[PDB]
Amino acid sequence: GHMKYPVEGGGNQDWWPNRLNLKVLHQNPAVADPMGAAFDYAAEVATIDVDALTRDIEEVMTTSQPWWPADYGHYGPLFIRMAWHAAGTYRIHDGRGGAGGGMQRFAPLNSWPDNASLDKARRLLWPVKKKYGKKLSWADLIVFAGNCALESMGFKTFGFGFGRVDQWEPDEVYWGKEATWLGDERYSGKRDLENPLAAVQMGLIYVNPEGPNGNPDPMAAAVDIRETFRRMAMNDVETAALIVGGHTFGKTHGAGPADLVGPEPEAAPLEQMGLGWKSSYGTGTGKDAITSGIEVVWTNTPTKWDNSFLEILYGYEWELTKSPAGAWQYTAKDGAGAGTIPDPFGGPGRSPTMLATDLSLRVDPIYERITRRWLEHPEELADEFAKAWYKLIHRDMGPVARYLGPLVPKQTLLWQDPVPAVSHDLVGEAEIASLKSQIRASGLTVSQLVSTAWAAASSFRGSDKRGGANGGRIRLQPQVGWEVNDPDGDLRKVIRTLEEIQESFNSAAPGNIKVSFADLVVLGGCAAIEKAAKAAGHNITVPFTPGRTDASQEQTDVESFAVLEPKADGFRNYLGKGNPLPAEYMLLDKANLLTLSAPEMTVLVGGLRVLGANYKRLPLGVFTEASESLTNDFFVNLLDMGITWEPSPADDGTYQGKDGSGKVKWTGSRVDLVFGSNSELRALVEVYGADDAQPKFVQDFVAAWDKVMNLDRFDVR
Amino acid sequence: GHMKYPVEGGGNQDWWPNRLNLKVLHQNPAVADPMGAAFDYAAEVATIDVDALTRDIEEVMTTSQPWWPADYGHYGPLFIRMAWHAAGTYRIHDGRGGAGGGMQRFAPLNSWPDNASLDKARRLLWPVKKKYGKKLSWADLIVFAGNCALESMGFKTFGFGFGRVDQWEPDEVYWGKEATWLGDERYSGKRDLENPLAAVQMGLIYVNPEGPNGNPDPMAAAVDIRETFRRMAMNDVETAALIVGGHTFGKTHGAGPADLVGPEPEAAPLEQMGLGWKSSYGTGTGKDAITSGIEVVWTNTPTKWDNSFLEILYGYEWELTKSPAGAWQYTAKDGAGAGTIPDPFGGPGRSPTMLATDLSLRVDPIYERITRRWLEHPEELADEFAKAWYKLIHRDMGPVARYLGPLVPKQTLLWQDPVPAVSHDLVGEAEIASLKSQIRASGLTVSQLVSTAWAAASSFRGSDKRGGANGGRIRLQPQVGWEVNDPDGDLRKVIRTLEEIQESFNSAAPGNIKVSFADLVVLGGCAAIEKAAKAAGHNITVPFTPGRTDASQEQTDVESFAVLEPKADGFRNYLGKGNPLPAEYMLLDKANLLTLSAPEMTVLVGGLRVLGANYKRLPLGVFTEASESLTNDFFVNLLDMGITWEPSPADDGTYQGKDGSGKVKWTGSRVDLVFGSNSELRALVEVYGADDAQPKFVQDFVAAWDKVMNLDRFDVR
Numbered sequence A, B: 001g002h003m004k005y006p007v008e009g010g011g012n013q014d015w016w017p018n019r020l021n022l023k024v025l026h027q028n029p030a031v032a033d034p035m036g037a038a039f040d041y042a043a044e045v046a047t048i049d050v051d052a053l054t055r056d057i058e059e060v061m062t063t064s065q066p067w068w069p070a071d072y073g074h075y076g077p078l079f080i081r082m083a084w085h086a087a088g089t090y091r092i093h094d095g096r097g098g099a100g101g102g103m104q105r106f107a108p109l110n111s112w113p114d115n116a117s118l119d120k121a122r123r124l125l126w127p128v129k130k131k132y133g134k135k136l137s138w139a140d141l142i143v144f145a146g147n148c149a150l151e152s153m154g155f156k157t158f159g160f161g162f163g164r165v166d167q168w169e170p171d172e173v174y175w176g177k178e179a180t181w182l183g184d185e186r187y188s189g190k191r192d193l194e195n196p197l198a199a200v201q202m203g204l205i206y207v208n209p210e211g212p213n214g215n216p217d218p219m220a221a222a223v224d225i226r227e228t229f230r231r232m233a234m235n236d237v238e239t240a241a242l243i244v245g246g247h248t249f250g251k252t253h254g255a256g257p258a259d260l261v262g263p264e265p266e267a268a269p270l271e272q273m274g275l276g277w278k279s280s281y282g283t284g285t286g287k288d289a290i291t292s293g294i295e296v297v298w299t300n301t302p303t304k305w306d307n308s309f310l311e312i313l314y315g316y317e318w319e320l321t322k323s324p325a326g327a328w329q330y331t332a333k334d335g336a337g338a339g340t341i342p343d344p345f346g347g348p349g350r351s352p353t354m355l356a357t358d359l360s361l362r363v364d365p366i367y368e369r370i371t372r373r374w375l376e377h378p379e380e381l382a383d384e385f386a387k388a389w390y391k392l393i394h395r396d397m398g399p400v401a402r403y404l405g406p407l408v409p410k411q412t413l414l415w416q417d418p419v420p421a422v423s424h425d426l427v428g429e430a431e432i433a434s435l436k437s438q439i440r441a442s443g444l445t446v447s448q449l450v451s452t453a454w455a456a457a458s459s460f461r462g463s464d465k466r467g468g469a470n471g472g473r474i475r476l477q478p479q480v481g482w483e484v485n486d487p488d489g490d491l492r493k494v495i496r497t498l499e500e501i502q503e504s505f506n507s508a509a510p511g512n513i514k515v516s517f518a519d520l521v522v523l524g525g526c527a528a529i530e531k532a533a534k535a536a537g538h539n540i541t542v543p544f545t546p547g548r549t550d551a552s553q554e555q556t557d558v559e560s561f562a563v564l565e566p567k568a569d570g571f572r573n574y575l576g577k578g579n580p581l582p583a584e585y586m587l588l589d590k591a592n593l594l595t596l597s598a599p600e601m602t603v604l605v606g607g608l609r610v611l612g613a614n615y616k617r618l619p620l621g622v623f624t625e626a627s628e629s630l631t632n633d634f635f636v637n638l639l640d641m642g643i644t645w646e647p648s649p650a651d652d653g654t655y656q657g658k659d660g661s662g663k664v665k666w667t668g669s670r671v672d673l674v675f676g677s678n679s680e681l682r683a684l685v686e687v688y689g690a691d692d693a694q695p696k697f698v699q700d701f702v703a704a705w706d707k708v709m710n711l712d713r714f715d716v717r
């Protein structure tokens, strides 16, 4: 190999290929954001004229463009494939992917094989982004072009939510190890797909449309449809609703050989202006379009909503054939329905065709039972496509407070993890003071208060903005019984105590003030950090924002919440079994999911350790001789060159630090030691380990802790 | 080949390996900085008791630590090598390298081979940094330790300035193409060393202590030293003074086999806490230490400033031999000097030894008379050394206004590109605003105004902070006939039209207020920009700050301003020969040297296009029909899908954009089109191309233009 200029990719990653990459803790840095620091997209969208945006979109859908003429003179279908592919990268394991950041316009997703032709699809909406400017993000516009497409073609959607903030540097997500497009190195066992992935091959949204590995077997393809969709929050009924209702519109494109198709956008020459997949077949567009290489037209009304798709799937029998590019697809046997399917540009009619994956809705017994009922009762299909399409293009929006606009329905949806609305006067500065003191007298230790508070709030992840302390769910299933949160039972004693305090406060309160459990969980950790700063000779108040309310078990989807459990949390020195990488990489990934910077991550580790927040209260990293005191001792001792460190003899992932006498003074994990070893983190430890650093250490730790307690509080922003 | 998790370095560089890398425009992001936004290092280092610091560094130097015992009981020489290596990465071609950022504490410099065992040298200064905290940067400290060490051991230095701010992420710099340490792929012809490097192998500071490619030919090593040191801005006399000066102290370390020496710090295990090159030879430290493999001790006074080096070099005859690690070195003939050189731990005492690099001082012609002189005139050695060492260590610190502390001598130095201080008074606001008219009322157009301003300020590189507009040096050589600056065009006409009004404003005689040329070059472009903005319905005011003064040709080292000649500047669509990478890369690179953000680069290019700023006022990129109007036109037309780009049939590295009618309407270069092709740039373009964007673009343009005019103005901080 050869080392390159940094402007062409070079860097220290090339000299130490598996080195921690701290650039994950500064994604989308403000230096790259062209908008001012005072710019609030939510404020812009709140003033947008929806009825004008809609018409300008319908005006775009029905005005063909010579560089990509419109099938049946309507782009609606194409925009549905666009919105579905923007949302369709979402995966449940890490919450990443999805439409919430508009990431389909940047690499690598803009160049994914399955996003072929969507480069053109987005281009067609620039006239729309231009008329509306800073009031409309690309993220909102992309997904809204589909919801407008549906309504325009006969399907009344459930509603819509604006508020997706545009970004400027693509989020980096691990999409698989395969270095080859459409590669498959992601299965083991009996068809067990590698977590966190949610697609069968590198570059696909979900499944191969020619069946597994290209084997056009409907019954097997359905195993993949079932499972990739599951990993995208869709059950059997939602998946069938989605596939059916989607293919009620539009058509495939495979008019000619696929080896006539040029390089993907990110690899294209300059003169193409961001567009890729340029084809020398015929016009290279329109009647000669080559997208997937398949050539199917599911319905006889490609631009209206009706029950044609299932009528057709069930009213013919199907045999296997080749498209003009040689891809597998099915056709109606015995020349049935010849000439019955309309042409994208006026040519002769054609005869019905389906994909392998479409036959799976009839051949699979679960899906047969679902689709046959909709054949006989199509109105059930409308209701389920409404719900599933809503879920799909909103799944990563986070709490409802974040949904803006006049088309936002008012109904509770379990998959949003609802939280009740405030019912009483929120707790003021005088009651917050009283409660910090009541909690400090309750008998709960500093460690109990800070662990519970952290466990509740750190359940947030910024990929999809699920999780967090609002809801009160640390006392509901499944969070009460996550291994990290409750090794030996202390958690339910804390819960018990905090509920007595809330009850007695609420029955004595002045007037109509009431505190929720969810708030007292957070308030308690703020109360302990104050007490523990005082013990170190710092008088400081920890901020606190009331407003959380208490969700109920019935309002908490236990299985949906399953993906949020930490298999590893380095802030509590917790390392469960089965993580993809060593503990220090997981630490950074957890730091990334909490939207934390390296300085913020560094300060919270050191504080949490001396506060006793360690899982099982283990001594790993607890480099202090004070109890329940918020000092910067973690940083000072990490830098003590009078300690010698070796891997512990029991090969237990711990380290032994010996002082001059050869006696063991400290013990540590890989997560602790990486702060003294990694030359960027050690730099940060030298900041907080200096003699003049303890007041700054305390202030910056309070700020980082307050930032974690508020991660889901979009109700106050 | 396998894609990796981002946290482990994976990203879109893996799928398109030569793609354009924009993080180069957000090095040292703010969210990675642990110091506040309001952190003011200058205001901190001013508080420092400099005498106490010196005393503390002194106590470090004489207290051996057991994990790296001190040769001769004094870490002074180690600290000087440390300091020489921290500065000794500098190179004149890009002004990158040098001690200004303290980059030796980070990758890859912390792990370069020549920087061996300096990890322990930096580790020894932790008690000092700990004591002084935020009032003292590692950058200042590393360098200042070497200066203190000199004085400590008998050499009075010319002085020292503070003010090098610590950074928190490596600066990634091209250090060569070789993917092997000590590798060599940089030499073509006969000894021609690829620009813009300044060392003979990958991971070296200058040259190979065993002669070129290990050939201990002093005469041949002299060619490397000369060419190598000249690229770090040292001439024959400076260079001879540094080698003699440095090797007055200390020794080399090669006590046993180098394969007993473990991995370098960035590849070393966690438990080594940032250190590397751990060694199973004997104790692995001290008398058994191994750093380079050579075992030479130059002087009999290794902790004192003497002339013993040159009396040894000339008082003996040097024959070839080998250290205990297969290392080529030189030693006395005939068993001369037996026992005269003392051992660093009370050993028996040894014969004299030199490096091949050392013998270049006696074998080469030019070095031999520099040196033979000093053999009888150590007062001249001493004087040149302090002159050169001072420069070696402040080369990248920029304008002398930046030098902080009580140790800065006021003597002007020529390499500092000195600028006369504001003698008279400066123009107040009613004087500036009364003075723009008299530039507007000149045959000078925006094209000549706006451009010439740009050519002045754009002279600045952020790497070593040299160049810039202050100094009036555009009137002077070599910025006079810089092929970018004048295609033999209106520059003199604008120069003398401005001098004409310089002579004219000062001769007016209102009092003390005299006006500098330099200040008017800058002021021209400002008012021009104001006219353009009114030419487009914006009554605008472009900020302006007086203070520049005009230097003289006698105070302008011409050979030292050569390396500031842009072989490329995309911002005026210029591209000479020789550039190592395509146009778009050198656009990004030049914007990095300008300390510009990607939003800033974009708004700038867009504005300068529509102002004829372009080299030879060529039409490439000028996507507007107005002249000298300030619009976003460049962005709007860049996003015009009715335009069709293809390379120009003439293959000039240009393109044509036809409007469907087949007639070329726009033409452009790569630099122009990369903004409409690259997915991240086009995102920006689409902010400033939108309908509601015109005010913000002007607003953002003035701010970004202001930034470039004010780059070197450290004199107003």
Ligand code: HEM
Pocket (backbone or CB within 6 Å): A071, A077, A078, A080, A081, A084, A206, A207, A208, A209, A225, A242, A243, A245, A246, A247, A249, A250, A251, A252, A253, A254, A290, A291, A292, A293, A294, A355, A357
């Ligand atoms: C197993 C599931 C699915 C498979 C295998 C699949 C595959 C495909 C393929 C291969 C194409 C056309 C590619 C080309 O143009 O060459 C397509 C088109 C399309 N897909 Fe699907 N898809 C699936 C699910 C969905 C879903 C969930 C939706 C939306 C809710 C959807 C909506 C559409 C639409 C509207 C088109 C028409 C595009 C146009 O008219 O230009 N598909 N699908």
Ligand code: HEM
Pocket (backbone or CB within 6 Å): B071, B077, B078, B079, B080, B081, B084, B206, B207, B208, B209, B225, B242, B243, B245, B246, B247, B249, B250, B251, B252, B253, B254, B290, B291, B292, B293, B294, B357
């Ligand atoms: C052609 C130029 C130079 C070459 C090839 C060179 C080479 C070397 C080498 C190989 C070592 C051995 C380090 C070890 O094994 O411990 C060394 C040590 C040293 N160098 Fe140089 N050097 C050069 C210029 C300089 C300059 C310009 C200075 C200072 C102005 C300097 C100061 C020192 C000092 C003080 C040491 C001793 C450090 C100690 O005692 O640990 N050298 N040099």
